[PDB]
């Protein structure tokens, strides 16, 4: 609907909020003293697709025609 709102049209008409899934980063801050750190136990393999337009046809125009 705009402004972070969404319309749920499954059972009856409801207006909810949108959220987004939170991601992480690959930069690890350096360990300079003894402390706690949070290491992963396992990983999920993920495929992400990305489309980018590169081409068009050319045109020749006879504007008198």
């Amino acid at each position: 609907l705009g402004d972070g709102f969404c319309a749920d049209l499954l059972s009856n008409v409801v207006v909810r909020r949108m959220t987004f899934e939170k991601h992480d980063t690959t930069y690890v801050a350096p360990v300079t003293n003894e402390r706690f750190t949070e290491l992963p136990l396992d990983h999920q393999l993920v495929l992400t697709e990305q489309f980018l337009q590169t081409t068009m046809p050319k045109f020749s125009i006879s504007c008198e025609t």
Partner: protein, 65 residues
């Protein structure tokens, strides 16, 4: 026309023509070529060139009644 010695020559025009022309410094035409006297003449008028360098020249069109 009275024959002398020759005679005044005559040409009845039947249709409208296109002609490519080259002018000199003073604006007087010093070189022409009719656009329908041949195949190369039509390409000369399409490109506005008398001496056509080699290339690929697109979208020449055929007229139909």
């Amino acid at each position: 026309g009275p024959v002398n010695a020759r005679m005044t020559k005559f040409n009845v025009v039947t249709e409208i023509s296109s002609v490519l022309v080259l002018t000199d410094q003073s604006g007087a035409v010093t070189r022409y070529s009719y656009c329908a006297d041949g195949f190369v003449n039509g390409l000369q008028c399409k490109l506005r060139l008398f001496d056509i360098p080699p290339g690929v020249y697109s979208n020449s069109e055929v007229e139909y009644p």
